[PDB]
Design a protein around this ligand. Sequence first.
Ligand SMILES: [Fe+3]
Ligand SMILES: [Fe+3]
Ligand SMILES: [Fe+3]
Ligand SMILES: [Fe+3]
Lengths: 200, 200, 200, 200, 238, 238, 238
Amino acid sequence: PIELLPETPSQTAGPYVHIGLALEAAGNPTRDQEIWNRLAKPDAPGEHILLLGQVYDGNGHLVRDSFLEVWQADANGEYQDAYNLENAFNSFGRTATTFDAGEWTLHTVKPGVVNNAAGVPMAPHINISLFARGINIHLHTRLYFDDEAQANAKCPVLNLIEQPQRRETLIAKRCEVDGKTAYRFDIRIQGEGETVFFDF
Amino acid sequence: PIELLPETPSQTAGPYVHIGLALEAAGNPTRDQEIWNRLAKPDAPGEHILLLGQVYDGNGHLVRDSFLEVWQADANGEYQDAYNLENAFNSFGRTATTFDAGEWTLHTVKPGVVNNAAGVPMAPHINISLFARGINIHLHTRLYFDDEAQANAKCPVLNLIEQPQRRETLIAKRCEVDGKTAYRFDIRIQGEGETVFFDF
Amino acid sequence: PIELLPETPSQTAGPYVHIGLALEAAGNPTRDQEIWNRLAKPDAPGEHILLLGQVYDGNGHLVRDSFLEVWQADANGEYQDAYNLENAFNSFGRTATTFDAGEWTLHTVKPGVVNNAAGVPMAPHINISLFARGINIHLHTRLYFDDEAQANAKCPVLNLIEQPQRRETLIAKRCEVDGKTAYRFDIRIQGEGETVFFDF
Amino acid sequence: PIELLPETPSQTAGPYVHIGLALEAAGNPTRDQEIWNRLAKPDAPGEHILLLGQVYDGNGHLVRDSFLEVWQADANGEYQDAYNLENAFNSFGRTATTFDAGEWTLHTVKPGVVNNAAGVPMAPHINISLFARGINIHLHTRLYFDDEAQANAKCPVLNLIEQPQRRETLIAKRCEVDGKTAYRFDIRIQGEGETVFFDF
Amino acid sequence: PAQDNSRFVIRDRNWHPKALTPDYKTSIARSPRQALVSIPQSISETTGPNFSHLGFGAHDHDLLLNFNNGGLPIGERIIVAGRVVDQYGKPVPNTLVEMWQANAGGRYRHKNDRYLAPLDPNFGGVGRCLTDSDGYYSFRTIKPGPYPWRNGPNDWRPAHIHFGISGPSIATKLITQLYFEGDPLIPMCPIVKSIANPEAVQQLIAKLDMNNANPMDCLAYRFDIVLRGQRKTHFENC
Amino acid sequence: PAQDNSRFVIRDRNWHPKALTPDYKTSIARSPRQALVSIPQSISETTGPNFSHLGFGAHDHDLLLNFNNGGLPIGERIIVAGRVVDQYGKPVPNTLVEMWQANAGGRYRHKNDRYLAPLDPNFGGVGRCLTDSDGYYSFRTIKPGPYPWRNGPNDWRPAHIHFGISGPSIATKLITQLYFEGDPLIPMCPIVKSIANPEAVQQLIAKLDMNNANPMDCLAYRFDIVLRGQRKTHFENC
Amino acid sequence: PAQDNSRFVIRDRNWHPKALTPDYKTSIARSPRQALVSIPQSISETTGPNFSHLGFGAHDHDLLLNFNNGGLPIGERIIVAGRVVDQYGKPVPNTLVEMWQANAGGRYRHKNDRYLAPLDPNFGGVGRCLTDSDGYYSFRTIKPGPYPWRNGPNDWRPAHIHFGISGPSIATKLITQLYFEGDPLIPMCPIVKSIANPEAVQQLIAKLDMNNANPMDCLAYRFDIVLRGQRKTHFENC
Ligand SMILES: [Fe+3]
Ligand SMILES: [Fe+3]
Ligand SMILES: [Fe+3]
Ligand SMILES: [Fe+3]
């Protein structure tokens, strides 16, 4: 059969990923422009939301050295690939877990609906890639919202998860944090309540 | 690189280990001198204690054919390596689980503090090696004491276990057996509450 | 390691090099345009000079079939690379030794100073490449001028020649040929007074 | 045939040999005890002498980074192998050429006569080993004395040099330096007056 | 905005390291036990950020100058350069390449590294750049030293530089490690050996590149990166 | 005027013939005995003449017509063509390729050649051309004959054409010789054997190229030339 | 005093590097052109200094502590250890082993080294020790970096440590260089290649020795040294 060049193989990001990709967190000086966890400036259109979460290993313990990359549509359901710190909104961001409490945060807007390739609407979601010591190839997941239950029930991606109980692992819980809408999305890498991870 | 002669590979001790190493327990006559579970003559220095425990598999069932070897400092923190049945104290001993109850016992004294190679005091501990049918290479662990909390919290070996919850698996529980001071040290080979095992 | 395509290997130009590269000297008709030994039109800027020299083998005998290529800055220290017989000045030229006397000649101007890659001025020089029967790969050298002693003493290329006595082999001697300013640059391929040859 | 383990192959000492073997000369602090160029304290028996010399390459230029080791008998013709800085005399010493003037020196006593293995007396000599950048395996030579001409004429080692003219290269020239007996021994590695070098 | 007009060749997850590679001890509790759920590519997966207009500092790619505290770092001066292409051999231009590493002694400038080898006051260990219009990137740095870590009782990472590459989409994004030609630690490392196929391991070994060296100044290593092949959609929804 | 904007890969002087190759007798007294002195590249070495504005005659590359004295030369009609590239594989366009050779009988049109084989009144033996924008050159000529020479007592050069190529700088300039596929004199020649590596010798052997032949007219040989690799400067003076 | 009671196996001067190895340029003018004169062993050649009573400082073998100016040197912490034996396999006890090297960046602490890589304020680069009663020696140091030198236009020494070994006599004394397992610079170095036989080159390559490493602290290399075989005299003068 036709064999292409093989892809460069993945390796773990390791526990010092912060020094390359999350400079503050390593305990280090930042450069003038950094890619970080504020996807939306106050003036971006849409519903401004706080996202937060913790990451657990198979023994139920906090993963305190997680690194997360996120990719989401704007409030119109359009992906904005022209990354610029001058933009009111960027579709891409990065965050990391605090070594102390183990919590990451993101400041963004709720994404609009986007269709799959077959033209069927997907429920609002944020695409997540998770890296850490111990993770040899990053884990892909999606964060959906518990205030979109009717949309989630019809999502063609959630419907590819055979068991309804496993779909629940992708649904972030709405709360209020200092009077702003927030959602908690915890990730369990292994075992009870294991988060669904995707291949694509 | 430099490659030395390879070490002879381990194999399981098997379920008849007692024939060779625990003769009474096999149902067999003993020889004049046997290496067994009474480390201390009644007048050896220090606090005389009973140690006892049961061993569990990953299904929560007793491992009734366990064989254990122990190595500990005397009450003055000295390792007595010149094994002799006439010694007041031997730092080495053997025991095995009863086939009925699955319980092993050891009669000893509480070990004194010894320093690690950097000169940092280790909390009082007994070194244990566990052998059995199903165990291809013996498992190393340490038994520490729940009434040495201050020392345990500062032990440079316990501190190498990343999770505090796992450190708890090595802490034996003070109790009384026939009115006498004892510590119970159960070992869980696999699963919930899995005992920390060491490589060195 | 990374291995590129190998360079085509050198071979001697042989004793009939003149057929291809010095047509007059071979005894043959010339083409309309030839690359030869008059680098400067009479009105080119700078001090007009004659260069001449003889080439000796390791036995002290004339190399009567030498072919030489030269490359030098113009009087303003500029390398004129757009070769054209209509140019006031060409930085490139060719010459060859006469078979009778073994003497080559070049008509040019004294080159201006150019800086090395670190910005340090080099003393005025002509780059020379020497080809002949018996020479398997051409020899690189430089002709400097004996009336530029101050510059020569500070030249970062001459200073890479470890022995002062060897630096002297690259210094052409001011003289007069038919009353006109000239510099003689004899080359000794081998032995006593051997000319410095470069690799770069 | 019988093949033993091969000897570790030699390599050049290189131009920074001083930092390992001639600490002062590298521009560096010395240790409490160094092996250097004073073989005899004032109180050693025998005729106290100064040795000096320069080393030349094949182009007649000074070798300014030479390192020399010497081995000689005491005034009785006995070799003293028990090296100690407390000794009035040591048979071994080291010296090096000044980077500036290129001269080495040694302070010693004139050695006594020693017989070869066949019982034939050798003329007084100092064994020399020469190391430097460009010397892949050290060169062995002997320094004999011009005030021993009658002994030198009968030396069985000098008589192994087929040509009388080459024997002259091993004869140091007696002089007086600030009222003390001295001998100059210059070494020419290559070419005119090339110093005899030995294999043994 | 971005459009869904490309598809990316499916990953070979036996060429990549699997999640559970127990000799690399931290992977045991940090690997999923359930199968990954395959999903078809949509615009969510086939698009990603383009960093053409991220503002880079003049020394961002130059670790010899980007933590300057009065001098040059100590260690083996090297250029690390290469090309990013996709599996079809097409260059990946204007893509973000980030890297981080230890200093010459194997010490990282991170609060959580307590290895006894000292920090270098003129080395920070982080670089980034964008590939050029032809897919090429370049860094100048010091060769990192090996370093011991609490896996087995005497485990040492080979000298390595961590790399992150964005590529055209979140489907192509990759984190990996570069190792150095001939390093005898490579075959011994449980992180290297998380990759099961020896030919895949070879793809992470940078080659000494004398052609790219600056004489009397610095050596050079070459490390090419291959991202998932990108093709146009064809015959979909018909 | 010319600028210093590039560097050239250092030559492998064990791939090239060495200076002293005593079986080629004239090399004994015409080889330096002192080592070459290495110097860094400057504008002096990294620039050189470009010949785009040299006026070439219509037949300068055609040896069948460029010495026309009433007829065609006698001999095996051949096209000699190829590509000039650098070591990175990049074509070298608009570069000067010059060649010279003996006639079909091994006689050179040079006043110092006294070989008894006759001159051909319609053959001169010199060609030049500039490579095109893709690096290709071509000449039309007759195949030269071997010829005997006063080295050993029975030495004969294989059939060969002398080549000179300018390239982008004086650092790239090269003179070499082309030999012909299968010629049994090649392994016997002390000039060929000045090159120590048999693989390097193979690089000088032109291959029969039937694809490029003119049927019923002339055969063709292909000879590709590789000059030193050229790269941009990087990280200099910093 | 010393006695003439042993003989030493004659050196193989085709196993050692020859004097004239022109690719190592400085050897051209520093090699004798006349043959060495062979002489029989006498007491002058078969004896030598014994350094049992030379006074060593406590850190003489420990380059991490022997130039202490307020800290530890930067670089790859290593032990370099091995055994000195003779060709018959007999250990050479109480023999002097001296070594010197560059720092982690390839810079030597010598007035004549002007390489642009910086000095390390806590590294000097010199060690010595005596072998023990069983022939073993040990040093602690930093792995030296490669360094560029003015031979060819882009030549670099592999990482190396210079060694001097006395042995039992002035006939056994040896200076050599240690190289490191897997270093891709080794086959390219004209000083390495002064040795004609590839098997002899292999004898200078130190092997990574994980068995001798201090976990979480330093790696280790093993380098064994073989001096000329020593035997008793037999059947002489009869
Ligand atoms: Fe790392
Ligand atoms: Fe059995
Ligand atoms: Fe010819
Ligand atoms: Fe060195």
